[PDB]
């Protein structure tokens, strides 16, 4: 609330504008495509996202943009969130975040490229499945994205908006938690039912979403509640209990942990942190499988 007007380090965030080399456009805030001069110790160069108001913008929309840095700044570090490299805030040129650059964008879409390319393990010689996803890579994402957001629950957050299209995907199987910010899109898929009828957000109703999630990732990138109409039926049975049937690359217990999430009251849904742990036995066990390199 008002996070626009929250304190600002710029000692350890303000960036050059000049060592910035704007690209081409991402999307659109709008995002757009850049190169850093040493922005981190890593490397003196570095491919990077940066998010700037666009021209002539209400002061309304420029408080919008001052308050997501904040927020970013505030929720901190996490390998799993979106990262916040610095930002271009004094005078001189257009406020400007700029974070990490994710390589193969959102998941929902990258997904849906793989369907020809996805096997649960693959068979030696391996080169045959030659950057396919395995079970295993589906489980990780789905750990990574709990870890993330057990991590924003720990920071009191709440993402609000948790879906396959709001995770990025970077090199080395390595997703990341972010929110474009976002009608077309069918938000009210993702929501809790009692989001829906009481408009309230809670970690909890993000446990649902994060079902809804899991959903898209066994899918690969399908579209949720394939084929039904989202009217007041939908909203109706959906309290009442009804639930998507398990999707084509499931696995019994990533079923089982869906329904889990999305149990009628909030309350009987498993916390993050439960979520984190149990994730990561699956990923364990799933590993236990395939041994042909003990
Ligand atoms: C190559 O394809 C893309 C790769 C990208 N890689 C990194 C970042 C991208 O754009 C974003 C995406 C999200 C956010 C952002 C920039 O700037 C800061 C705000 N933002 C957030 O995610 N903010 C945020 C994060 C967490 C929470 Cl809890 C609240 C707000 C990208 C966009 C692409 O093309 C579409």
Known sequence: EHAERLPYDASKWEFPRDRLKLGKPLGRGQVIEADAFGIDKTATCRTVAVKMLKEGATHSEHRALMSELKILIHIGHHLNVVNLLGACTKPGGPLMVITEFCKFGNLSTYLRSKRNEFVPYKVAPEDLYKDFLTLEHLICYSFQVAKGMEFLASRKCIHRDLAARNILLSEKNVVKICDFGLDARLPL???????????????????????????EIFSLGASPYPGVKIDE????????????????????????????????????????????????????????QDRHHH
Not at 273 to 279: I, T
């Open 189 to 215: 898929k993702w929501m809790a039912p009692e989001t829906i009828f009481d408009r309230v957000y809670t970690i909890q109703s993000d446990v649902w979403s994060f079902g809804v999630l899991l959903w």
């Open 233 to 288: 039926e939908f909203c109706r049975r959906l309290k009442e209990g009804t639930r998507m049937r398990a999707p084509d690359y499931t696995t019994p217990e990533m079923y089982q942990t869906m329904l889990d999430c999305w149990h009628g009251e909030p309350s009987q849904r498993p916390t993050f942190s439960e979520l984190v742990e149990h994730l990561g036995n699956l990923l364990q066990a799933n590993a236990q």
